[PDB]
Amino acid sequence: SNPVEEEAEKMTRNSWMMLDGTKTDFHITVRNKSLSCAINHIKIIPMNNIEQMLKPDYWKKMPPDDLYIMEKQLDWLSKSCVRIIKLITFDLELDNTAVPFNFTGFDLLIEYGMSATDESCIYLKKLSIPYEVTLRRTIEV
Amino acid sequence: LLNMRLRNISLKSEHCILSSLDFQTSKASEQLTKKFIYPQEHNSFLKLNFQEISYKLIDGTSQIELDPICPLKVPLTAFSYDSISATFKLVLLPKSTQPHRVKITLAYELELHPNLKLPVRTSWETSLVNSKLSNVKFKFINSNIKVIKGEKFTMRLQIINSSSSPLDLVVYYNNTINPITLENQYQLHNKYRKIAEGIILLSNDYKIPYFADLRFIGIMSGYYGTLSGLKVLDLNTNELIEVGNGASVLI
Known part of the structure; x- marks a missing residue:
């Protein structure tokens, strides 16, 4: 019997504008009690790497496709903005969802927040929150 | 058996249940110590409440009040302090613990020392x-x-x-x-x-x-x-x- 120790450590329809949400909802952040983050998050700012995927999808589309960076990946709608933190909860950052150039291919989003309280060791478990958002077709050419 | 304590909990609509504890010097203890103090010619007592705190759970976290609180001392009185719990969508009832420190100072700087600690579930x-x-x-x-x-x-x-x-x-x-x-x-x-x-x-x-x-x-x-x-x-x-x-x- 080989033991170890025990160490204690929903959106709505959006147009093509930019919505900045300051979130103070029921974030768990499952530490012991009164979790001070000690390096706070001010603005998370997603929908940047979705554009940094979408412009190479255009460029990937420019020649014939042979899965150079499109190989079964459904990570457009994932929106995995990893919130890295340092060492009873705290309010979340400003969103700035900022849908000014994004495809109609997605109809959902998620997130992941690194819950961290490190004492001379490596990092810890990590908590993820999804967000369902629909988009409005405001204009076409 | 010197200060009767009760806790009242209310459910605000902004997803924050507010629970207030109330403390009051009980009248039987008042007359009990009052006749023996007025034998030595004392009319007003002095129960010094110097350390009052509330704890959260199996890991002890000290949820603060909604305002400030000094270290007060009075006789034949009552005081209530309100903390803000978090509203639970599930059926997990939080069980909290409170503690006080009443210094029952008899006169000419000859003080006793009393402490008390209750623990119950913050239902509503x-x-x-x-x-x-x-x-x-x-x-x-x-x-x-x-x-x-x-x-x-x-x-x-x-x-x-x-x-x-x-x-x-x-x-x-x-x-x-x-x-x-x-x-x-x-x-x-x-x-x-x-x-x-x-x-x-x-x-x-x-x-x-x-x-x-x-x-x-x-x-x-x-x-x-x-x-x-x-x-x-x-x-x-x-x-x-x-x-x-x-x-x-x-x-």
């Missing part, structure tokens, strides 16, 4: 408009409390429906008096009067087509909590959904 002893028929829900996306003057303004409905036929509903405000003890008669008349001409809808009889922006203008000053003039009619199987939501002060 037991809006989104939804219809009765189908999946159709209503909620105002903009904050239902709003501060406006009598100028033009806007308000935002939102519909979550079954995706089978999302359309076929109409809104209207019905600016007419509902057709009704003279004192209760005229009170119900004043309620039905200031409902029926207080605000007016700037697009009524309005076909809807998952948002629906509908625009008012407010005439008469006053707080219209659950402003119940506007009445979304469902066309098929002719019934009416009241929208008892939203509350606009007009000052």
Whole structure:
């Protein structure tokens, strides 16, 4: 019997504008009690790497496709903005969802927040929150 | 058996249950120590409460009060401190612990030392408009409390429906008096009067087509909590959904 120790450590329809949400909802952040983050998050700012995927999808589309960076990946709608933190909860950052150039291919989003309280060791478990958002077709050419 | 303590818990609508503990020097202990103190000619006692604190759970965290608190000392009194717990959507009842330190100082700097610690569960002893028929829900996306003057303004409905036929509903405000003890008669008349001409809808009889922006203008000053003039009619199987939501002060 080989033991170890025990160490204690929903959106709505959006147009093509930019919505900045300051979130103070029921974030768990499952530490012991009164979790001070000690390096706070001010603005998370997603929908940047979705554009940094979408412009190479255009460029990937420019020649014939042979899965150079499109190989079964459904990570457009994932929106995995990893919130890295340092060492009873705290309010979340400003969103700035900022849908000014994004495809109609997605109809959902998620997130992941690194819950961290490190004492001379490596990092810890990590908590993820999804967000369902629909988009409005405001204009076409 | 020197200061009887009780805790009262209330459920605020802003997803924060507020629990207040109350402490009061019990009268039997008061006369018990009071006759023996007035034997030595003492009229007012001195129970020095120097360290009062509340703890959370199996790991002890000290949830603070809602205001400041010094180290006070008085006799024949009562005091209440309120902490703000977190509202639980599940059936896990939080069990908290409180502790105090009453220094029962008899005179000429000859003080006793008493401490007490209770621990119990913070129970409470037991809006989104939804219809009765189908999946159709209503909620105002903009904050239902709003501060406006009598100028033009806007308000935002939102519909979550079954995706089978999302359309076929109409809104209207019905600016007419509902057709009704003279004192209760005229009170119900004043309620039905200031409902029926207080605000007016700037697009009524309005076909809807998952948002629906509908625009008012407010005439008469006053707080219209659950402003119940506007009445979304469902066309098929002719019934009416009241929208008892939203509350606009007009000052």
